Amino acid sequence: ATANLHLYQDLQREVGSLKEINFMLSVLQKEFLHLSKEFATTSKDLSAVSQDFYSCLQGFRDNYKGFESLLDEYKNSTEEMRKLFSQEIIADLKGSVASLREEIRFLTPLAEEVRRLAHNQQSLTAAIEELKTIRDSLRDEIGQLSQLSKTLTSQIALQRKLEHHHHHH
């Protein structure tokens, strides 16, 4: 089994990446709020998908809180708490992080590409379809991450309460 210090270092790397992903998704969220309002009277379908990006990216930081919390538990940890450093779940997280980074890569140019097309009286049909496809992929990835994170939050919270309870004596 992988040493807990190495799993801590793996988690440190992935939580650092999650914080970058969170920041980049906050920028993209705001960009799609703008796009949604800009296009509300010009392209109802573009406006609706743009509002969907705004909505599905709400509270993204909360969707990895269990990982961030786990990382924060290592420094002065008990042996029991360190059982929550699961090599399978940290390896699974690495896949989520990579997939989210790639979704960002594909999404990054698309709002200003829509604006460019619209300013030139060009069709938005293909762009709208691409946006709906990325929205669906991103919802799937965020759901998978959120479930892993929420499980960890529950486990850490209970173990922390238990360890604090022992300080009655």
Residue numbers in the entry: 86 to 254
Paper text:
In this paper, we describe the molecular architecture of the prototypical bacterial SNARE-like protein IncA, which mediates the homotypic fusion of chlamydial inclusions. We demonstrate that IncA folds into a stable, non-canonical four-helix bundle that is maintained as a monomer by intramolecular interactions.
To better understand the mechanism of IncA-mediated membrane fusion, we generated high-quality crystals of a chymotryptic fragment of IncA spanning residues 87–246 (IncA87–246) and determined a crystal structure of IncA87–246 to an Rwork/free of 14.1/16.8% at 1.12 Å resolution. The electron density for IncA87–246, including the six N-terminal histidines of the affinity tag, is exceptionally clear, consistent with the low B-factor of the crystal structure (~10.8 Å2). We found that IncA87–246 adopts an asymmetric and slightly blocky conformation, somewhat similar to a four-helix bundle. The tertiary structure of IncA87–246 consists of four down-up-down-up antiparallel α-helices, named HA-HD. However, IncA87–246 deviates from canonical four-helix bundles in at least three aspects. First, the helix HB is interrupted at position 144 by a glycine that generates two shorter helices, named HB’ and HB”. Third, while helices HA and HC run parallel to each other making an acute angle of ~ 10° and bonding throughout their entire length, the longest helix HD makes a 40° angle from helix HC pointing away from the Hclamp and gives an asymmetric appearance to the helical bundle. The hinge and the amino acids preceding Hclamp were found to have significantly higher than average B-factors (~ 26 Å2 vs. ~ 16 Å2), possibly underscoring intrinsic flexibility. Our simulations showed that the structure of IncA87–246 is highly stable and is unlikely to be a metastable intermediate.
